[PDB]
Structure formats: structure tokens, C-alpha cells
């Protein structure tokens, strides 16, 4: 996957208008975008769809699917006919959860994003503990795609050397939750940026920034 | 607690408006609980809820297993109780300050919350099970009072019971498809789920019937 600016925006304002509008005055800076459960039950599956016919970009739907296989498998399918075109997964309910997703993805020319340690501090109750097991699941299951946490660059890199350079690592908590960009693009392929930007008074200067920031890394 | 007709919750998990719509019509005279997930309102929008109050005026419980970091989970519950929702369904996993979002939300809004603990499936072996004593114990200290735990497993949803005691409302999906016994279930549940077995089924309502007439001596 190849994310402009190695820049994915979080779009997780809940009314139609301003996430249309925020989104296109970032739109010079990325083609990637990341839309979660916020903007989709605030506006219904349709928002993919427009957000395509408006910007073109590449869509990851952020659902953090974590039921059990056959529900997995009609979730990942409803977010598939909507248009995504990546979904993200939770790894802690297990490999046969996963699967299921892997299925419908390859069924449906997608592809799957393993989340396997999360970033705020809650994570570090259970999920830290399991991140390593989960991430190396992924690798038994040819998971390609995964989710690491910005705030906790040692565990981003672990996370790295579990998947290999090969892989493709998207990581948030840059900018609101204290993770650094520069710092997790040593790790990441691309950082995931919500508040930061699209709270931000001017969105677009929001993101010029953070891009100047990584230039070098570009 | 939720007072659940013949303790039985329907998992509508069809992902067509149409036949959504008939089958919990079918039912309605056996069941006043419904358990709305992904399947059908990624497929038909968050409306359905109105749909289904509007139609059957059935108690809604949204099963979306809330699994992100505490600002989002705020938002999701938000959006959901605003819908119509009487409660939502959130994961423990991802640790107390994500479930506490949820809690502050439902309480604020005059809503529920039910703590998911360990799940029914095989691949919860893997990594829930390890944590699930755990984090029952946690939602029991955070104050959640309604729970959801396995009925594939009696000897892992009796430790559920014993852990959040018997005041709390525990409810028990995993009944008919996935293997688990009803009148078995009940011994620790409050109420079962059952999906498959009801909305697969030639009649709906003959198999809703046939499940409550197993268990007619637990009611
Ligand atoms: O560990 C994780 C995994 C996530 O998907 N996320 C998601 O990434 C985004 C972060 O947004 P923000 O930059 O506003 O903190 C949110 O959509 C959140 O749900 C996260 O914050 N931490
Ligand atoms: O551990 C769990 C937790 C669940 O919510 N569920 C949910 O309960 C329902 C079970 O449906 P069924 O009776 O068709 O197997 C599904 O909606 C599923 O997502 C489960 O099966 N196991």
C-alpha cells in the first residue's frame, strides 16, 4: 500500500459536513483516509462510498472486529459491499477470528490490518501481555498488514521485528496521545493523525506541519 | 435488572431489512429483547433501531463489542444510545479506562452497559479466556452490572456467575448453533441468546416455542 505523505487521516468527526469539508482541505496531503465507527453510525455505510466519489482516496475502515468467525465474516462483508478497501481487525479474540476476515478479504480484493497492541493506557492491562502472541499469530496466518501503537515506540519496534521489513505497520496515537511523528515513522510506514488535524483551527496548516516535520522521511 | 421475557434475547443477524423485519414480527408474542449487531446495521443503518421500537417496541440491545481507546468508545456510545439504544455491548480487553468511557456515557445519558467477559467461540481458548476472571473482576469494581459470557463453556460461565454474584445480569449467547444447551445455560444466566436456531429456522416462531417449552419449568 502506498500512502501518500506515509500520512493516513483519522476522520472521526460525526456529522457529514465538516468531515467532508475538513477532509477536503487536507486533500492535497494524502490519499489515504481512515473512517471509524464515529462518522459511520453518526452517517451511515453510504459516507465511504461519497468520500470515494469525492477524493478518490483509499479507504481503511477502522471496526476493530472482534466477534466471533461467523459474525466476523458478515461484518467484513457489509464493510467490503460499502466500499472499504481495508478493514482493522482485533487479534486478541483469537486466530479463527481472524481468518474469517482473511477469508472475505481475499474473496473480495482486500485486504486485512491486524491490530495487535493498542496505545492508550488501558492496553497495557491485558492486551500488552498478548501483543508479541498476536503479532506472531498474524505472521502464522500471512497477516501482512498491522496496527501498533505511536505512544510506545520499544513496543512499535518490537512489533517491527516480529512482522519483519516486509510488512506494512500503520500506527496511531501521534499528536493528541503523545506519540511523536518522526519517532514512529522510524518503525511505521505511516502514521495515523485524528485530533491533530482535523481539530485543529486550520486543518490544512495542521497537516503542512506535521509533513514538514517528516520531510526528510519522505 | 432488564426484565426479559421467557429469558430468551433473539440475535438478529439476517443483513436484510425485509427479512429482519419478518422474522422478529414472528417472534414478537415469545420475545421483547433484541440483540441488534454489525450484521444488520452496517447493512441497513443505524434507523433500524427506530424500525424495530417503532414496530415491536422490543428492548434493543446493540452487541458492537466496543474494542477502542477510551475517547472513541465515548463516541461510539454516544451514537448509539442516541439512536435508541437501551444498551450497548463493550469488550474488556482493551482495559478499564475504555470500559469506564462507556460507563460514563451510558450514565450520563440514562443508558447501559454490558461487559462482555469471555467469549463463546474456540478461539477464545487463545487469549480471553487467560484474562476473562480478570476482567470480570474489574468490571465488578468499575460497578458494571450486566454481563455476557459463554454458554459453550457451563464450567467458565458458572466462575462468571460466582465472580460478579447473583444480583448482576448476565446473559449467555453460544445456545442452539454453537453447541450450547438452553436449560443447562439458564443455570447461571439470566437470559440466553440464540441467533441461528430461531432465524434460520422453516418458523421462526415454532423454534422460539420450542426452545421456551425445554425450559418452561425455569420460568
Ligand atoms: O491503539 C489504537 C488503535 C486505534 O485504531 N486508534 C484509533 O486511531 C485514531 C487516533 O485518533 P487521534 O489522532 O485523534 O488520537 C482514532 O480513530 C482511534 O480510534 C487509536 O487511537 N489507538
Ligand atoms: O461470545 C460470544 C459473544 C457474542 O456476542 N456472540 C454473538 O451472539 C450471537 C450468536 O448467534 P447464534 O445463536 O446464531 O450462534 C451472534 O450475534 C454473535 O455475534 C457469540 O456468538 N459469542
Redesign the interface.
Request: hydrophobic fraction near 45%; charge should be negative; glycine fraction near 10%.
Given at each position: 500500500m502506498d500512502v501518500m505523505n506515509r500520512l493516513i487521516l483519522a476522520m472521526?468527526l460525526?456529522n457529514r459536513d465538516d468531515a467532508l469539508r475538513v477532509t477536503g482541505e487536507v486533500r492535497e496531503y494524502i490519499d489515504t483516509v481512515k473512517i471509524?465507527?464515529?462518522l459511520?453510525?453518526?452517517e451511515?455505510?453510504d459516507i465511504i462510498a461519497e468520500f470515494r466519489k469525492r477524493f478518490g482516496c483509499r479507504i481503511i475502515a477502522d471496526?476493530?472486529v472482534?466477534?466471533?468467525?461467523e459474525?466476523n465474516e458478515?461484518?467484513c462483508?457489509?464493510?467490503f459491499?460499502?466500499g472499504a478497501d481495508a478493514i482493522i481487525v482485533?487479534?486478541?479474540?483469537?486466530?479463527?477470528?481472524?481468518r474469517a476476515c482473511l477469508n472475505v478479504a481475499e474473496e473480495m480484493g482486500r485486504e486485512v490490518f491486524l491490530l495487535t497492541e493498542?496505545?492508550?493506557?488501558?492496553?497495557?492491562?491485558?492486551?500488552q501481555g498478548?501483543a508479541d502472541?498476536?503479532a506472531r499469530?498474524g505472521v502464522d496466518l500471512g497477516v501482512k498488514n498491522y496496527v501498533g501503537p505511536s505512544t510506545r515506540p520499544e513496543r512499535l519496534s518490537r512489533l517491527r521485528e516480529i512482522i519483519g521489513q516486509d510488512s506494512f505497520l500503520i500506527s496511531p496515537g501521534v499528536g493528541a496521545?503523545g506519540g511523536d511523528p518522526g519517532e514512529t515513522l522510524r518503525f511505521a510506514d505511516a502514521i495515523i493523525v485524528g485530533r491533530s488535524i482535523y481539530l485543529a483551527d486550520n486543518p490544512a496548516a495542521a497537516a503542512a506541519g506535521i509533513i514538514e516535520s517528516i520531510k526528510d522521511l519522505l
Open positions: 472521526d460525526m471509524g465507527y464515529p459511520v453510525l453518526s451511515g455505510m471496526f476493530k472482534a466477534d466471533i468467525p459474525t458478515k461484518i462483508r457489509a464493510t459491499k460499502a482485533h487479534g486478541f479474540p483469537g486466530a479463527d477470528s481472524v493498542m496505545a492508550h493506557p488501558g492496553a497495557e492491562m491485558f492486551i498478548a502472541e498476536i499469530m496521545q
